Structure formats: structure tokens, C-alpha cells
Swiss-Prot record:
RRM domain mapped to chain residues: 3-84
Gene this chain is encoded by: Hrb27C
Function, as annotated: This protein is a component of ribonucleosomes. Could be needed to organize a concentration gradient of a dorsalizing morphogen (Dm) originating in the germinal vesicle. Interacts with grk mRNA (via 3' UTR) and involved in its localization to the dorsal anterior region of the oocyte during dorsal-ventral axis determination; may function as a ribonuclear protein complex together with sqd and otu. Required for polytene chromosome dispersal in nurse cells during oogenesis. May be involved in the regulation of splicing.
Cellular location(s): Nucleus; Cytoplasm
Domain of life: Eukaryota
Knockout-associated phenotype: Lethal due to developmental defects.
Part of the whole protein covered: 5 to 88 of 421
Protein name as it appears in the record: Heterogeneous nuclear ribonucleoprotein 27C
Subunit-structure text: Interacts with sqd; the interaction is RNA-dependent and may be specific for sqd isoform A/sqdA. Interacts with otu; the interaction is RNA-independent.
Length: 84
């Protein structure tokens, strides 16, 4: 997979729906999650966005800085977790 972005530095208030809304300005999104604490269900302050078109990752990176919910957030390209 080529189109996955890690996004760090999120406020714990930011929902994955809001995260997706923000990053859709750079392309169609096929997955967007905010990682949650297993016990509490609260955001851990980071997530992942997967673009349908992997060329959109570089478009995000060259059009910063990025702010969401009053935080400067930290999008980075990532090599995705591999499955079976």
C-alpha cells in the first residue's frame, strides 16, 4: 500500500470524522481512524488517513503547515502494517 498517512499531534477532542473531513481537501479517502485507548475509548492523539490515490500523500506534505482544532498536526507518510 502506498497511500497511507500517519497524523500525529491531534487534540484528543478531534474525531476521525473531522480528521477525514480535513484531509479530504487533498483527495478521496478510503480509511480514516483515530487510535483509541482500549480501556477508556479516548483518543490517543494520533490517527491514520488512507487516500484512494497514493499520489495525494505528497500533496498533503507539500501544502503544510496543517492545523486542526487549534493544534498544528503532524502528517507523515507511513509504510502500512502488513496483514495475512
Amino acid at each position: 500500500e502506498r497511500g497511507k498517512l500517519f497524523v500525529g499531534g491531534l487534540s484528543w477532542e478531534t474525531t476521525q470524522e473531522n480528521l477525514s473531513r480535513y484531509f479530504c481537501r487533498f483527495g478521496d479517502i478510503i480509511d480514516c481512524v483515530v487510535m483509541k485507548n482500549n480501556e477508556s475509548g479516548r483518543s490517543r492523539g494520533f490517527g491514520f488517513v488512507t487516500f484512494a490515490d497514493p499520489t495525494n500523500v505528497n500533496h498533503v506534505l507539500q501544502n503544510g503547515p496543517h492545523t486542526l482544532d487549534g493544534r498544528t498536526i503532524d502528517p507523515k507518510p507511513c509504510n502500512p502494517r502488513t496483514l495475512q
